[PDB]
Design a protein around this ligand. Sequence first.
Ligand SMILES: Nc1ncnc2c1ncn2[C@@H]1O[C@H](COP(=O)(O)OP(=O)(O)OP(=O)(O)O)[C@@H](O)[C@H]1O
Ligand SMILES: [Mg+2]
Length: 468
Amino acid sequence: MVVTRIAPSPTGDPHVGTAYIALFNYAWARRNGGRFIVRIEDTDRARYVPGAEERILAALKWLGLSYDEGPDVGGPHGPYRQSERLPLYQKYAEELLKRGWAYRAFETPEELEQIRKEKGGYDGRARNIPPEEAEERARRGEPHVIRLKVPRPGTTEVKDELRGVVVYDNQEIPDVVLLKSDGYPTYHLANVVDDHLMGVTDVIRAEEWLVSTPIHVLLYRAFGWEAPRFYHMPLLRNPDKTKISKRKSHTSLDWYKAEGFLPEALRNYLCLMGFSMPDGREIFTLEEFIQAFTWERVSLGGPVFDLEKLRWMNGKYIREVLSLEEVAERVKPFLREAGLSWESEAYLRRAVELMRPRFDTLKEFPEKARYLFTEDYPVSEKAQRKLEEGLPLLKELYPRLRAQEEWTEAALEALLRGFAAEKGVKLGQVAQPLRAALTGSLETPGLFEILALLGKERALRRLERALA
RNA sequence: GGCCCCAUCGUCUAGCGGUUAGGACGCGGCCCUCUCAAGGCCGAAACGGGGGUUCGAUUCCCCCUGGGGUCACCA
Ligand SMILES: Nc1ncnc2c1ncn2[C@@H]1O[C@H](COP(=O)(O)OP(=O)(O)OP(=O)(O)O)[C@@H](O)[C@H]1O
Ligand SMILES: [Mg+2]
């Protein structure tokens, strides 16, 4: 069948680039009724951020991706955390050693630097050490690394499923270290070994690994294993076209969730990063994505992550994809984070309904609708100017309002329109100042619905403070 | 700099030899209207350059230019 995977490195916040690559591996497997594996790349004890594994796994679930095998769901070929597979890599490294495909190198980190300075890059000088001497210096515990012994001279054919064949010159392929001196392996060794054992057939990864591919082709050869298919996705780019980074852009998935972006929206935007539906439709579900997926419709340009477009999309989900009730539920955390409270579900729902077309992120709701949940709301200078300029009218309207029995949006409009005509003035001249009194703002939803929402008492009370 | 990838509006993109080069975000105008949005309508905006192949190239081939990636005991 088809088996894909993601090899996240727990070395920082959950990265949007990871979600992007995960999105495509997930789809390709589901499209082919296959498996989607999650393997953690925690072999660099130096860059390892404790607490990063949980975070990445949660973000993937947050976006709606589900994996078939992984650290927290088990699987037939575990462990799924490389740190727990160390003896395995040791074993395979020595296998290459015995097959003449690798060798032990004892240069100190400082000699290597000096070698890189003079001859630019390691010169494979350790290949001249007699195997028995290397084997002996190893048993004496001399610190060392194991390097891939690249066939020299020569050529190595790599095949990218989206770009075609690419012939490399072995002189371009360095004798990369396979097993570090601390016993930990490098991506190069662990990638191949683990992809093999877990049976992955389709390796879909970021284009930044294209050049390292001939190293993997060589390793699969060394082991006598069949190489999987390679699909390299273009890198997500900052606005300046450089690979998306933490300083020119927002790469942390937690930042997106914190800002009120809907996972559905983010996932949908990410699909547009290199892929498009035949009919050119831009809003679609995760499932529709799986079904319509085809490497034929994947573009290879480095897409710029456009926040403005994400916001647009998020707003689109808020008002056209999720139900009223769903938005109401998703907005709660944000109200709580703003120290605000709603009186009941009924109230919140109507509040959300009135604002639906006015907020593009869940975080924006408590901001623009603050006056619907607390008395502690701000008053814009323009609102104040408008309030003071219409006090006389409001003063004459107030008595009519305290005597209004039927407190409905229909009745209220009738009264106000009538009052405006009877006072020989345009509605706006009575509605605008009233809006200011009620909301401390001049940018709000319809006056009649805002006036009704609160009820007679709550509305008059607030109206009285503006006239006091 | 060496090697490798990429090339349609500012951005995401549709073209797969013959199209007024389409859509979306953003931007401007208009409509709707009690404000602000949402929504509808209209509009400005692209094939980097030079050779070719071909009756004909944005579509196919080559060079140039441009952009990006990669050159570790990180991935
Ligand atoms: N900036 C990025 N843009 C696009 N894809 C990325 C990016 N970074 C990583 N990927 C891809 O997403 C998957 C997960 O990458 P990973 O979890 O290692 O994050 P990372 O940003 O590569 O961190 P590290 O510094 O360890 O390389 C990979 O298979 C890799 O190809
Ligand atoms: Mg045009």
